[PDB]
Amino acid sequence: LDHAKAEAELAINIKKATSPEETAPKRKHVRSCIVYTWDHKSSLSFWAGLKVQPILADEVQTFKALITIHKVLQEGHPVTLREAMANRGWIDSLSRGMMGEGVRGYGPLIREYVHFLLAKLSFHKQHPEFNGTFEYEEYISLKAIHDPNEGYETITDLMTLQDKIDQFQKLIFSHFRHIGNNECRISALVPLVAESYGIYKFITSMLRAMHSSTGDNEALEPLRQRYDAQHYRLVKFYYECSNLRYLTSLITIPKL
Amino acid sequence: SLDHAKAEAELAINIKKATSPEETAPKRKHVRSCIVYTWDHKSSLSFWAGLKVQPILADEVQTFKALITIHKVLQEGHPVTLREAMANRGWIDSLSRGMMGEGVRGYGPLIREYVHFLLAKLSFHKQHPEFNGTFEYEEYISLKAIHDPNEGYETITDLMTLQDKIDQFQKLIFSHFRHIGNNECRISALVPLVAESYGIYKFITSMLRAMHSSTGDNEALEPLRQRYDAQHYRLVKFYYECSNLRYLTSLITIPKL
Numbered sequence: 312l313d314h315a316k317a318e319a320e321l322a323i324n325i326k327k328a329t330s331p332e333e334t335a336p337k338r339k340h341v342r343s344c345i346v347y348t349w350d351h352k353s354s355l356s357f358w359a360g361l362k363v364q365p366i367l368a369d370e371v372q373t374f375k376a377l378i379t380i381h382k383v384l385q386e387g388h389p390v391t392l393r394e395a396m397a398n399r400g401w402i403d404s405l406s407r408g409m410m411g412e413g414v415r416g417y418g419p420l421i422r423e424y425v426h427f428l429l430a431k432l433s434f435h436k437q438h439p440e441f442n443g444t445f446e447y448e449e450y451i452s453l454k455a456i457h458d459p460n461e462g463y464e465t466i467t468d469l470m471t472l473q474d475k476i477d478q479f480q481k482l483i484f485s486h487f488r489h490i491g492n493n494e495c496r497i498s499a500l501v502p503l504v505a506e507s508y509g510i511y512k513f514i515t516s517m518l519r520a521m522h523s524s525t526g527d528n529e530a531l532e533p534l535r536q537r538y539d540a541q542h543y544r545l546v547k548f549y550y551e552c553s554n555l556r557y558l559t560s561l562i563t564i565p566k567l
Numbered sequence: 568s569l570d571h572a573k574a575e576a577e578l579a580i581n582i583k584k585a586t587s588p589e590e591t592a593p594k595r596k597h598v599r600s601c602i603v604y605t606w607d608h609k610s611s612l613s614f615w616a617g618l619k620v621q622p623i624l625a626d627e628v629q630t631f632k633a634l635i636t637i638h639k640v641l642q643e644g645h646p647v648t649l650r651e652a653m654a655n656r657g658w659i660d661s662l663s664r665g666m667m668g669e670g671v672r673g674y675g676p677l678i679r680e681y682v683h684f685l686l687a688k689l690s691f692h693k694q695h696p697e698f699n700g701t702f703e704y705e706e707y708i709s710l711k712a713i714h715d716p717n718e719g720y721e722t723i724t725d726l727m728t729l730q731d732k733i734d735q736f737q738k739l740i741f742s743h744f745r746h747i748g749n750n751e752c753r754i755s756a757l758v759p760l761v762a763e764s765y766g767i768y769k770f771i772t773s774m775l776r777a778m779h780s781s782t783g784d785n786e787a788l789e790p791l792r793q794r795y796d797a798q799h800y801r802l803v804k805f806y807y808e809c810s811n812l813r814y815l816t817s818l819i820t821i822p823k824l
Contacts, residue, residue, distance in 0.1 A: 464596060468818065474820040530603055
């Protein structure tokens with residue numbers, strides 16, 4: 312069967328994406344996990360595949376699994392987000408540090424990632440119309456007229472998610488050991504840049520759209536103030552990212 | 568902005584849906600519509616009047632949800648809302664009295680405590696109209712405290728009193744958590760209390776810091792330092808208990824003290 316071929320191949324992708332190698336999850340295999348969700352309009356074999364891995368024995372393998380999960384939530388078929396809701400309990404179980412076991416010290420990073428991913432899934436449950444990177448043009452195309460009162464509440468939820476990303480990236484930067492490169496730690500910043508920029512772009516477009524063309528727009532000033540605060544804070548994050556040679560080799564850091 | 572009569576009619580629908588008997592958080596877009604109304608018309612009078620022809624007191628969940636909605640409108644509405652709220656103190660008080668007791672679902676004590684807190688909040692804003700409803704930080708308030716330390720002392724004391732009200736109320740809300748049910752309606756009241764407590768905390772911290780440099784009288788401010796420390800440790804515990812609530816953390820960032 313070519314069906315059994317497809318299942319066998321995804322199993323290899325998940326395995327190799329979460330190997331013991333202390334670096335970024337192998338891109339071709341993470342890419343193949345993402346593609347699988349689009350090809351079959353289903354992520355069920357992805358979640359099943361991760362559950363049968365020997366990933367809890369090494370905290371690097373657990374951390375690489377969470378990076379892979381994050382990327383698949385971001386870029387996979389929309390159903391991936393829906394099917395992730397049933398796996399909240401399993402995702403929460405990864406926040407342990409049984410084996411690893413703090414020789415390289417990923418425990419705090421694993422707990423912070425699990426907290427973030429559950430917060431991401433909480434948002435997508437509340438706001439199912441979004442895709443994994445909060446695309447504005449995809450979001451606003453689904454209806455003719457959009458409620459600015461829903462828009463206000465949605466932005467404050469996104470800003471709260473932006474705060475979790477900023478806390479998490481700062482924790483990753485603190486864990487950088489001086490000599491000998493931190494490629495696995497730095498690789499987690501790749502989807503965090505994508506997440507934070509996705510949020511930034513949407514809030515920019517939506518907050519602009521909500522402003523009445525003339526008048527003071529007094530009601531939106533709390534969002535403007537928090538938007539500006541998060542902008543300058545995101546500039547600092549992206550400046551620190553642009554000075555990492557390994558991170559800039561993987562992605563283009565947004566300007567802002 | 569629409570026709571006045573038609574605008575009040577649409578606001579009535581928002582108030583109705585926000586205060587429905589569904590044991591949930593007040594439906595957020597309708598609470599937002601109530602807040603936005605005050606900015607659009609530069610007046611909260613329609614909101615207060617709209618609440619008067621919305622039956623809520625027969626159902627404890629509706630009454631508690633109404634008090635959450637009132638709290639959010641006081642926080643985020645046009646500044647005139649706080650002034651116009653003063654004439655509705657008697658009515659807010661009436662929501663608790665005509666006593667029920669516990670109630671079937673146990674919102675009775677939470678209702679009475681929310682009314683108690685909201686009256687204390689309005690008492691503060693009457694005495695101290697320089698602040699806004701959400702205690703959005705303004706450095707100017709600490710500058711006033713530098714130049715008028717007698718006034719600053721009294722304002723810090725009153726801020727601390729309001730902080731104690733929030734601490735007592737949040738403790739009561741946590742004690743009424745039930746293992747059956749998502750606790751969303753109860754937890755949706757904690758959200759504005761966390762926001763308000765932090766705003767108060769930032770003001771107390773900055774004003775008390777500013778007053779030590781200006782006056783140089785460590786003996787006179789010692790009671791405020793003693794109370795500050797106590798309230799700090801309480802607030803850490805409050806924010807710690809909130810950190811494990813996933814509905815709350817999805818809506819607001821908990822401060823790290």
